[PDB]
Amino acid sequence: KEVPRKNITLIRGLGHGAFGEVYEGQVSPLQVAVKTLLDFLMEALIISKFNHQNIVRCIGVSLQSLPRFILLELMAGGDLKSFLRETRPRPSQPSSLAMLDLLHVARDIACGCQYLEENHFIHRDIAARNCLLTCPGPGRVAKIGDFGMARDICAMLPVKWMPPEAFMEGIFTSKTDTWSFGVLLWEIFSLGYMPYPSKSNQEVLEFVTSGGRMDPPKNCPGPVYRIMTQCWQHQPEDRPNFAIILERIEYCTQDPDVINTALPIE
Ligand SMILES: Cc1cc(Nc2ncc(Cl)c(Nc3cn(C)nc3S(=O)(=O)C(C)C)n2)c(OC(C)C)cc1C1CCN(C)CC1
């Protein structure tokens, strides 16, 4: 749990996290991500309560010295949104990334979602910016890296990932997680585009509450799009839970017409 800081050497800034900047770091020699700053406690104990292969591991905290640190598993592949964007196939080197790689990422996150659902934990912010990769190449494993707004129970709410009952009522349940997962899937299969690409948050609210949903990402196979559309059913009771989602993802991985489908080139 507590790590003095005598052992903690920072190495490089990684970018700006939820509360602050995150560093690649070491401990002794464990390479780690050092996340910085109730909430302090909320974030910390939460991710540390879990034990699952598709959730980032917590190594410890450094709390008696300031700034305050949570030390997490270092995910050498960075975040999923950046990965998909920098690995889009191009005209210059067009990439190794294929449909099956996309389905594996999807499968890894759902398996982490399914662990949460089974433990009655509501994420509240399933989105590609919160997903990390063990490494950039084949055999990469995707993990959930940050937990949502159990730091809660705002143009700051991630409306584009939220179902109606969540944005209009403040109702969050596993089925509101299912909705967000559908949107992630869209993010995955569009290769990192912003959801509802040409719309504002206010437009989206209006769009979605009256039944509007996103078109398939370009070249998205029908069976994958169908998972999204099922995740976006208006009534939460009609949404699939994560064991169904994973079952469906897994059929996708077994259908050649899905996995042989080529990614669009940029
Ligand atoms: C985004 C990012 C993350 C990691 N590794 C990492 N590992 C473990 C954790 Cl828990 C983690 N969390 C984290 C990093 N950042 C910026 N924000 C967070 S966050 O608040 O925890 C949340 C938004 C996931 N990050 C990374 O490391 C390797 C390349 C060495 C590089 C990037 C790069 C993305 C794009 N490149 C160009 C620069 C940073």
What are the extents of the domains in the chain? Answer: 1-74, 75-255
Which has the closest alpha carbon to 248: 53, 103, 54? 103
User: What is the set of active-site residues?
Assistant: 125
CATH number corresponding to 75-255: 1.10.510.10
Distance 77 CA to ligand 1 centre (A): 8
Give the mutation target among 10, 19, 21, 22 for probing the ligand 1 site: most ligand atoms within 8 A of CB.
Answer: 22
Topology of the domain comprising 1-74: Phosphorylase Kinase; domain 1 (3.30.200)
Distance 113 CA to ligand 1 centre (A): 20
Residue written as tokens 């190495």?
11
Q: CA-CA distance, 27 to 6, in Å (whole number)?
A: 9
71: Cβ below 6 Å to ligand 1?
no
Which has the closest alpha carbon to 50: 105, 119, 110, 151? 119
Q: CA-CA distance, 220 to 227, in Å (whole number)?
A: 11
Q: CA-CA distance, 181 to 54, in Å (whole number)?
A: 14
Which has the closest alpha carbon to 10: 52, 60, 69? 69
Residue partners of 146: CB distance under 8 A and separation at least 6 = 17, 18, 125, 130
The answer to the question of whether 73 is labelled as a binding residue is yes
Helices (H) and strands (E) in the chain, counts: 9, 7
Distance 141 CA to ligand 1 centre (A): 15
DSSP letter (8 states) at residue 136: S
Q: CA-CA distance, 112 to 247, in Å (whole number)?
A: 14
Which has the closest alpha carbon to 123: 185, 74, 64, 179? 179
Give the mutation target among 10, 12, 14 for probing the ligand 1 site: most ligand atoms within 8 A of CB.
Answer: 14
What ligand 1 atom has the least distance to the C-alpha of 17?
20
List, in sequence order, every beta strand (DSSP E) within 18-92. 21-26, 32-36, 58-62, 69-73
Q: Per residue, what are the HEC states of 145-172? A: CCCCCCCCCCCCCCHHHCCHHHHHHCCC
Q: CA-CA distance, 91 to 264, in Å (whole number)?
A: 11
Residue written as tokens 């039944």?
211
Q: CA-CA distance, 114 to 160, in Å (whole number)?
A: 22
Distance 169 CA to ligand 1 centre (A): 32
Cβ-in-10-Å burial (0-12, 13-18, 19+) of 113 comes to buried
Which approach determined this entry?
X-ray
17: Cβ below 6 Å to ligand 1?
yes
Q: Are the C-beta atoms of residues 185 and 231 closer than 8 Å to each other? A: yes
Q: CA-CA distance, 112 to 52, in Å (whole number)?
A: 7
Q: Is the peptide bond before 136 cis (omega within 30 degrees of 0)?
A: no
Looking at this protein, which amino acid is placed at residue 52?
H
Helix (H/G/I), strand (E/B), else coil: 25: strand
Dihedral Cα 182, 186, 191, 194, nearest 10 deg: -110
Q: Is 120 left (phi over 0), alpha (psi -120 to 50) or beta?
A: left
Which has the closest alpha carbon to 152: 50, 46, 236, 57? 46
Biggest CA–CA distance in the chain, Å, is: 56
* PDB resolution in Å: 2.1
Give the mutation target among 75, 85, 130, 149 for probing the ligand 1 site: most ligand atoms within 8 A of CB.
Answer: 75
47: Cβ below 6 Å to ligand 1?
no
Cβ-in-10-Å burial (0-12, 13-18, 19+) of 105 comes to buried
Q: Are the C-beta atoms of residues 257 and 249 closer than 8 Å to each other? A: no
58: Cβ below 6 Å to ligand 1?
no
Distance 207 CA to ligand 1 centre (A): 32
CA distances from 142 to 110, 132, 221, 235, 237 (A): 10, 5, 21, 29, 28
* CA atoms 103, 109, 111, 117: torsion sign: negative
Dihedral Cα 44, 50, 56, 62, nearest 10 deg: 30
Q: Whose CA is nearest to atom 31 of ligand 1?
A: 78
Fold match between domain 1-74 and domain 75-255: no
